[PDB]
C-alpha cells in the first residue's frame, strides 16, 4: 500500500503516512518516555521528555509530535537522546517538592519511575525551590499545585474530552500556574479522570486521601453497574 518504511535502531517497520516517531517506536516494541503526551488527547509537545535522535540529523526531535518520513533511522538509545532525557528530568526535578512520603502517588508516580529509569541519581540544584498556593476546585479532587509539572494534560482533557473550559494557565514563565483564576469548582460527570491523567500527585482523590499505597492493594477486574453502559 502507501506504507513508508522507517527504521528503529536499525530494525525496519512499515508505518502509515502521518505516523509519529513515538508510534513507530511503539510498533517496534519500545515505549518512549513521556509526560505530556496522551494517546486520547491532542499533542502538546511541552515536557520535551520524548526527545529522540534521528540518524544523520544534528538536532533531536520530539517523538510525540514529529511525523516520521521514509528512510529515517530512529536512534532511541543513542548517547544524545539519553543525555536529553537526563537533562529534561533534571529540569523537571529542579523545582519539584520533596513530598514523596506524604504524596498519595508514591509507588505509582511517572515522575519517580522515569527518574529511576531515564534520569540521573543525584542533583546539582543549589537554589531554593518555588512554592505555589493550592487551588480548590471541589470536594472530589484534592489540589496540590506545588507538585504540578505544567504538562497541561488536565487542561486538554477538560477542554476536549469533558467539554468544560474552566481550567487554564495563568502567568508567564516559571511562575505560570494551572487553575481557574477564580474560586470555581470544576464540576462534571467526568471530573475524576483528571486524577488519572495527571502523572504527578498535583491532582489526587480526596476521598482516597492517605488511605493506602499502590503496592499493598490487590486489583480485581470487574464491571460497573451504576448505569447501563457497563
Amino acid at each position: 500500500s502507501n506504507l513508508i518504511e522507517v527504521f528503529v535502531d536499525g530494525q525496519s517497520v512499515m508505518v502509515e503516512p502521518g505516523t509519529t516517531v513515538l508510534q513507530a517506536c511503539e510498533k517496534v516494541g519500545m515505549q518512549i518516555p513521556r509526560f505530556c503526551y496522551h494517546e486520547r488527547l491532542s499533542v502538546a509537545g511541552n515536557c520535551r521528555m520524548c526527545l529522540v535522535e534521528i540518524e544523520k540529523a544534528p538536532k533531536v526531535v520530539a517523538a510525540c509530535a514529529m511525523p516520521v518520513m521514509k528512510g529515517w533511522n530512529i536512534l532511541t538509545n543513542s548517547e544524545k537522546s539519553k543525555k536529553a532525557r537526563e537533562g529534561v528530568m533534571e529540569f523537571l526535578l529542579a523545582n519539584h517538592p520533596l513530598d514523596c512520603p506524604i504524596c498519595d502517588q508514591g509507588g505509582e508516580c511517572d515522575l519517580q519511575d522515569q527518574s529511576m529509569m531515564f534520569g540521573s541519581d543525584r542533583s546539582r540544584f543549589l537554589e531554593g525551590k518555588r512554592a505555589v498556593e493550592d487551588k480548590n476546585i471541589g470536594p472530589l479532587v484534592k489540589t496540590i499545585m506545588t507538585r504540578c509539572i505544567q504538562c497541561t494534560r488536565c487542561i486538554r482533557f477538560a477542554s476536549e474530552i469533558a467539554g468544560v473550559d474552566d481550567l487554564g494557565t495563568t502567568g508567564r514563565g516559571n511562575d505560570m500556574q494551572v487553575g481557574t483564576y477564580i474560586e470555581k469548582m470544576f464540576m462534571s460527570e467526568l471530573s475524576g479522570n483528571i486524577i488519572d491523567i495527571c502523572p504527578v500527585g498535583a491532582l489526587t482523590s480526596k476521598p482516597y486521601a492517605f488511605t493506602a499505597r499502590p503496592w499493598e492493594t490487590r486489583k480485581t477486574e470487574s464491571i460497573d453497574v451504576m448505569d447501563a453502559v457497563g
Binding site: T170, R172, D175, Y181, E183
Partner: protein
Amino acid sequence: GAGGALFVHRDTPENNPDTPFDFTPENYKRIEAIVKNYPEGHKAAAVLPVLDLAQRQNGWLPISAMNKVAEILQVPPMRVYEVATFYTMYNRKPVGKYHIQVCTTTPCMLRNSDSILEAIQKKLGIKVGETTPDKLFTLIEVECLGACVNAPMVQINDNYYEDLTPKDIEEIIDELKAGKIPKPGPRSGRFSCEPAGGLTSLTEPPKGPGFGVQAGL
C-alpha cells in the same frame, strides 16, 4: 527578581463580578470594527484588542471587564483570564493616571539608567513598585522598550521621554504635576536618534522617483 504580582483572583468589594462595567456606544462601534477586521468564524482573534479598549475606557481591568469581553466575543471567560494574565500591558490592579515605566535592561543600564530611577524615587517619595498617595503616579520597572539606541528612556501613558538625565526627569515630573502635557521625544536637542554631532549619513538631498530603475521596467 521575583515579580510579586499574583496570578489568582480573590473577590474584593472593588473587584467582584457584580462590579458595574460596560462599554460606551462609541466603544461598541470600535468593537464592531475590530471584529470586522478578522475573518468570519474567528472572532476570538479580537480578544487582545477589545480587552485593551476596555482598559482604555476604565484605566484598569477588573474581573467584570474580563467577563464582559468574554460575553461579547462568545468565548469562555477563562480564555480572557489567560490572555489578561499573560500580557504585561494589562493592568489587573488600579494604577495612577500617570503610569511611569523605566527601562533598566543592559543597554539602558549601561548609560546610568539607575540614576533616573533614583531621581524618580526621590522626587516621588515612593519605592520601585508603589503608588503615590494622591493616585497621580505609579512607578514600574520594565524590560527593553525599543529605544535602546537613545537611552535612557521612560514611558508615561503611550509617550516616550528619551535621552533623560536626573534633571530632565525631575522637570518632566514637575510639569506633569502642574497639569500641562510635556513634549515627548529625546531631550538634549536631539531629534529621532540622530548622531549628536556626527551626521555621518543622510546628508545629501534624497534622489527623486525612478533614480535607478533597471531596464525593461
